[PDB]
A paper describes a structure:
To confirm that metal binding involves the MIDAS motif, we produced PilBD319A in which the key MIDAS residue Asp319 was changed into an Ala by site-directed mutagenesis. Binding assays performed with PilBD319A showed that changing this single residue abolishes the metal-binding ability of [name] for both Mg2+ and Mn2+. Next, to determine whether metal presence/absence might impact the 3D structure of [name], we solved the structure of PilBD319A by X-ray crystallography. The PilBD319A protein readily crystallized in the same condition as the wild-type (WT) protein. We collected a complete dataset on crystals diffracting to a resolution of 3 Å and solved the structure of PilBD319A by molecular replacement. The structure of PilBD319A clearly shows that no metal is occupying the mutated MIDAS pocket on top of the central β-sheet, which is consistent with metal-binding assays. Although PilBD319A resolution is significantly lower than WT, it nevertheless allows for meaningful structural comparison. When the vWA modules were compared, we found that they are essentially identical, the Cα atoms superposing onto each other with an RMSD of merely 0.45 Å, including the two arms flanking the MIDAS pocket. This shows that metal binding by MIDAS has no detectable structural impact on [name].
Type IV pili (T4P) are functionally versatile filaments widespread in prokaryotes, composed of type IV pilins and assembled by conserved multiprotein machineries. We show that [name] is a modular pilin with a bulky module “grafted” onto a small pilin module, which directly mediates adhesion of [name] to host cells/proteins. [name], one of the three minor pilins in [name] T4P, exhibits a canonical N-terminal class III signal peptide, the defining feature of type IV pilins. The larger size of [name] is due to the presence of a C-terminal domain readily detectable by bioinformatics, which belongs to the von Willebrand factor A–like domain superfamily (InterPro entry IPR036465).
Residue numbers in the entry: 43 to 461
Write the structure that this text describes.
């Protein structure tokens, strides 16, 4: 009657579900983060593992008093010297609950035809569940906590927004006043304020505002922590005087300003949210590029000024001079377009070292005004950081992407904080 050992492993899994249901956060670990005993065990995170030897399902708890783990035997009995194997997986989710699938199996010393409890399914009462297993692992241990992480590293966020003429029109590109619609800038103000409000919910996060047009401008150069009142930023955002559309689209300068402001801050989690609503058509060059017939001035003739051998302005000193500007008001010159994108590429390559991710949002109803958002995002990707491009064609879509960006920020915080 082998039903005894099978029922034993089932009782053990019942104990596991009982303990997991009470957890606020879950993390599936592997051979790296759990090789049995307290080896490599991370502070303040209780576990549930297969026991370094391999036959007693172990449960390590956090004493928090003696600052140590309290080894305990899962359930209360002990099997009859059987070879165990445990494996956890994230099997999707029910309505708003997430499902886990414990899989306990075992064989017996120097024999075959193992025995097992096929695969269970347990729904957790939380949503903060992640997996820290990789490429060829299984997930053999479980990490959790009862009370939330009692405060962790801070986050820095730079909002590089477009403030060009292409932002005064509709989303759908029609006229400003000829239609009863709100300009891209107005809707950006609304959605950005909503983002700011729901962003402070992360806690320990500070955001600054950078605006780019023909050149870049610091709307709020000081990184104000939302924990001390979000109203400090919202005001500057809704301030009717500043932040109005004017000029060509120069993303390189905006990236430079945002990345430098992020490099300054001490938060070990830096992010840049860039919003553009037009094809890139401008860039800034170094004073050196102002040599012989290197600057072709078709400004009054064909409406543009280009540089044959552009030496992009990548100096930490932020300044603007019309004489060092390359642009194409009609955004029809492929040379100026490619150079405007390469400018942001070099800027990201130099000022984007400790940046976690760069979110590029193309906010435009015109199907072609944001045709290079993906290209610009990929170019910025050369800096060696995570880059995500997204297109928002309506107010609802813009709010959806802003909310999703906040969600991803919280997931990176929870993941980085608490393994």
């Amino acid at each position: 009657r082998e039903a005894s050992i099978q029922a034993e492993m089932r009782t053990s899994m019942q104990y596991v579900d009982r303990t997991v249901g009470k957890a606020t956060s879950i993390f599936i670990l592997d051979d790296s983060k759990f090789k049995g005993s307290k080896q490599g065990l991370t502070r303040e995170w209780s576990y549930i593992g297969l026991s370094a030897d391999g036959k007693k399902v172990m449960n390590y708890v956090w004493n928090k008093q003696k600052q140590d783990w309290d080894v305990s035997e899962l359930g209360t009995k002990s099997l009859y010297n059987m070879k165990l194997d445990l494996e956890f997986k994230t099997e999707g989710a029910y309505q708003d609950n997430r499902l886990i699938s414990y899989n306990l199996t075992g064989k017996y010393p120097d024999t075959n035809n193992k025995l097992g409890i096929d695969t269970a399914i347990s729904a957790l009462n939380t949503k903060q569940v992640f997996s820290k297993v990789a490429k060829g692992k299984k997930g053999i241990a479980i990490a959790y906590r009862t009370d939330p992480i009692q405060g962790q590293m801070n986050i820095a966020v730079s909002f590089v927004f477009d403030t060009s003429g292409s932002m005064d029109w509709d989303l759908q590109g029609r006229n400003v006043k000829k239609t009863g619609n709100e300009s891209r800038m107005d809707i950006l103000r609304k959605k950005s304020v909503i983002m700011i409000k729901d962003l402070a919910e992360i806690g320990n996060i500070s955001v600054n505002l950078v605006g780019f047009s023909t050149s870049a401008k610091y709307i709020q150069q000081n990184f104000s922590n939302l924990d001390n009142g979000t109203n400090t930023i919202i005001a500057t955002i809704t301030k009717r005087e500043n932040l109005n559309p004017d000029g060509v689209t120069n993303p390189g300068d905006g990236l430079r300003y945002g990345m430098i402001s992020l490099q300054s801050q001490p938060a070990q989690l830096k992010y840049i949210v860039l919003l553009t609503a037009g094809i890139p058509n401008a860039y800034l060059v170094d004073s050196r590029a102002l040599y012989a017939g290197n600057r072709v001035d078709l400004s009054q003739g064909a409406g543009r000024v280009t540089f044959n051998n552009p030496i992009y302005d990548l100096s930490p000193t932020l300044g603007y001079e019309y004489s060092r500007l390359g642009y194409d008001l009609y955004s029809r010159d492929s040379i100026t377009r490619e150079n405007s994108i390469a400018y942001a590429g070099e800027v990201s390559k130099k000022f984007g070292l400790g940046i976690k991710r760069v979110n590029v949002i193309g906010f435009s109803g015109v199907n072609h005004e944001i045709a290079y958002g993906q290209s610009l995002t990929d170019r910025i990707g050369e800096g060696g950081m995570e880059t995500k491009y997204v297109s928002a064609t309506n107010e609802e879509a813009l709010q959806k992407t802003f909310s999703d960006i906040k969600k991803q920020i919280q997931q990176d915080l929870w993941f980085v904080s608490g393994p």
